[PDB]
Design a protein around this ligand. Structure first.
Ligand SMILES: Nc1cccc(/C=C/c2cc(Br)c(N)c(Br)c2)c1
Ligand SMILES: Nc1cccc(/C=C/c2cc(Br)c(N)c(Br)c2)c1
Lengths: 114, 114, 115, 115
């Protein structure tokens, strides 16, 4: 129900081995850990959650862009890229959070399909 | 060897049934038709060419964004989106041209892999 | 030393009256409110801070994109757009944080200049 | 009435000394040269045309991104970035064509205002 795809605008490639952490907003307005992983060779992270666990709520997808750039020997601007959104049941069911990274910039979009 | 993927930033969806025309630059500096199609339900166009036909050269991928927006009853800015690039054999072999569309803006990137 | 510029990719216009909240990470790892404002008719927000006040640190610029889209009567995807960065750690710089907004997407960039 | 602004997503800076060529589609469907220039130290190019000269038509703004990246000794993907649009067809407008450049990617947006 939740996939993350990360691309590198400098090299024209998937962004491989990027750490991604997903959080769900709690009752008390704190962010609790939900799911995490590292992007694959294709820049994707699947298997984060199941339909059962992925209930409506506010989620945060934190992409560790700073470590990615440092590993390539490049100095970046951002600490991370943050994507914060509400999951809504009356919308389509599958969510892809995509991000396109540069050292001083990033783009993100949502592809929400049935 | 050549794929095109188009996404809609307004609706958060693949951009379906978008016309795409690919041209190769000729000897005489004109653009000759090479391949075309319409994006699928997943916003993708595959099957444009074969390894045999896709030789080094300058290519132009023209995405008919104006018709896409008009079909959705939205007034757009651009006539089309143009992506012009050199195919180079010493680089990886598979090229994905991706575009993310809004009515007054678009993003494009290349994912070139082996 | 800190300016924010926001554009609307749907309308082809500045994004006007966008709320922006800036935080700075404290010693204790909490996010302390630092400054806030709204974009002008030109999509810009100046006057957030001073060179004296804008010390080294980790800053978070939260752009209230959901409130913007909803005020236009549109239902967007994201809650906000958050831009988090270390500033002034090699001395004072001038930062422009720019953002380009669509209902299901945004991009952001930084322009950093050394006065 | 026509301005071009270019930023560099790698450096976090204006994209300086970027060549830009503007064409206008002629009666005979050819692209006629209209104006040209280079971005300044601020990444901007003004002075391309006048309200008198900038009549209705289909315009192409070609941003010479390959020449920019190569002048910095980098091998980029795209030949250029081309922005094609109808202008002034409901009367005179002011157009800003903005672009944000990376070696394998770019984004472009338009800001259109009615003076
Ligand atoms: N599923 C799939 C497969 C291959 C490529 C993509 C690209 C997504 C994507 C995201 C952002 Br953000 C921008 N700006 C761009 Br242009 C493209 C998606
Ligand atoms: N007028 C003005 C002054 C200073 C900065 C800007 C930035 C514009 C801009 C264009 C694109 Br294309 C993207 N993706 C992003 Br983000 C921002 C505009």
């Amino acid at each position: 129900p939740l996939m993350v795809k990360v691309l590198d605008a400098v090299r024209g490639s998937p962004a491989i081995n990027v750490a991604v952490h997903v959080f769900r907003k709690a009752a008390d307005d704190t962010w609790e850990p939900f799911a995490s992983g590292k992007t694959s060779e294709s820049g994707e992270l699947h298997g984060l959650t199941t339909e059962e666990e992925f209930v409506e709520g506010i989620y945060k997808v934190e992409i560790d862009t700073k470590s990615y750039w440092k590993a390539l020997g490049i100095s970046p601007f951002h600490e991370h890229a943050e994507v914060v959104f509400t999951a809504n049941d009356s919308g389509p069911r599958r969510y892809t959070i995509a991000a396109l990274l540069s050292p001083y910039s990033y783009s993100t979009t949502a592809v929400v399909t049935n």
